[PDB]
Amino acid sequence: RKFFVGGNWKMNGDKKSLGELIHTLNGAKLSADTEVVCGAPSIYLDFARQKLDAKIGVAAQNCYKVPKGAFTGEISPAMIKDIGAAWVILGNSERRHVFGESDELIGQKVAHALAEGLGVIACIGEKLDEREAGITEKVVFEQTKAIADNVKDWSKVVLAYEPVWAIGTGKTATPQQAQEVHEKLRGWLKTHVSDAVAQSTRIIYGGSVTGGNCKELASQHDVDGFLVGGASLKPEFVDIINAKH
Amino acid sequence: RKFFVGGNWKMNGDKKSLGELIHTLNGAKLSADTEVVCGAPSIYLDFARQKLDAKIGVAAQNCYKVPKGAFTGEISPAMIKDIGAAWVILGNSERRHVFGESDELIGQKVAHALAEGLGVIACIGEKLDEREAGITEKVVFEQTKAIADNVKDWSKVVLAYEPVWAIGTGKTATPQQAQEVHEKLRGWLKTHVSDAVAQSTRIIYGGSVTGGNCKELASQHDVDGFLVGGASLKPEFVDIINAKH
Fold this sequence. Notes:
- Two copies of one chain form a homodimer.
- Chain A is α/β, with parallel strands linked by helices.
- Chain A has a single domain (1-245), classed as Aldolase class I (TIM Barrel).
- Chain A is built from eleven helices and eight strands.
- Chain A has an eight-stranded parallel beta barrel, surrounded by four helices.
- In chain A, α2 (45-51) links the parallel β2 and β3.
- Chain A is globular.
- Chain A binds chain B through residues 8, 10-15, 39, 41-47, 60-62, 64, 68-76, 78-80, 82-83, 89, 92, 94-95, 98-100, 167-168, 229-230, and chain B through 8, 10-15, 39, 41-47, 60-62, 64, 68-76, 78-80, 82-83, 89, 92, 94-95, 98-100, 167-168, 229-230.
- Chains A, B: Keywords: Cytoplasm, Gluconeogenesis, Glycolysis, Isomerase, Lyase.
- Chains A, B: InterPro entries: Aldolase_TIM, TIM_sf, TrioseP_Isoase_bac/euk, Triosephosphate_isomerase, Triosephosphate_isomerase_AS.
């Protein structure tokens, strides 16, 4: 399984500061064994795809579930592919908990981005109260089944486990906490889809990944890479891409 | 009061078709006395501003309430200015009734957009059930107060009245129904803000405007223009811009 790291820039940047970040990544020595994709703000997607070297993919941070229509504020898979981006991040913690997107809506968005030929980074994760109630497994298998029910071809899907308590807080899951869930998730895929999909699907971890802690997390057997937020805007993003070296 | 027509393209278009539409508008005979702005998908805002003539304004279709942050999928006033757009549409009927944005949130967005120096087209409107119940005035005045209580400078605000039953349906409000609401909203503005604000603030109508009905609507005394949806994607949008000729 090729190591994967996505950088989600969230609502940050302008052309000058993102042009500078893109020049850094294009000049840097990035492992050819890592699949790198950057998720730009929708207003900067075209600029990003035109600037970035072709080996680095571009991801939209969100999309809607139909090609066109009266949905002011939304963009569709058709528009993302038009600009040349090849991925979309769906079901992220902020979309679910700050903007209230449901499992059913994230599921409809996944089926439609895949039909439209886009790759999907699909995010799952439990809240602090759920982790402490000991229902982490129940919660993430429920979100994963919502996504799975909408995936015909798993070869363009990357699952991202991002515990909500670990996003932007600085409280990173320990290597053993991230491994335990990745391994349970991969068994869920083995018994509910097939062993072939369990073995080939990348399951990445997100939630306060930094240059300083990425190598020990990357050493866990079922951690296939990372979804990186705040540190995707800093030069240390180059070290996270290179975590296995 | 300068006649204002805003075209909201909603989630429509690609670079070929919006490039065509833009070439048409740039070469058209557009009234010297009309203020035109096009509301483009976020992914094409930079494209749209590079291609449209400088006389035509560009509007974002939504924005969030702070300059930067962990808000995946959102864009800010700061990024909108960075691209050269001068306007944002806030509180449109789909943001309210499809995506659940409340009056409190729309009010916070208006304050923030204006604090960053963007003009705002703020939308309000009642549902068919509220019109049938006789409470149109109650609803448009509480949605306008939520906006008005958050406006420090009215120079940059354009109010848009878009009855929900008239959007996408072809059931346009009659001139007399439009004039009734626009006249009452201008009266609310005279007594809750000031007379000078009531006299210079444009109040535009949206909801199934077409090249066939725009002249009747535009001769009404308190209708200062239009917020066009579906017809903004067509050649007849030029006739709506020229609705007083």
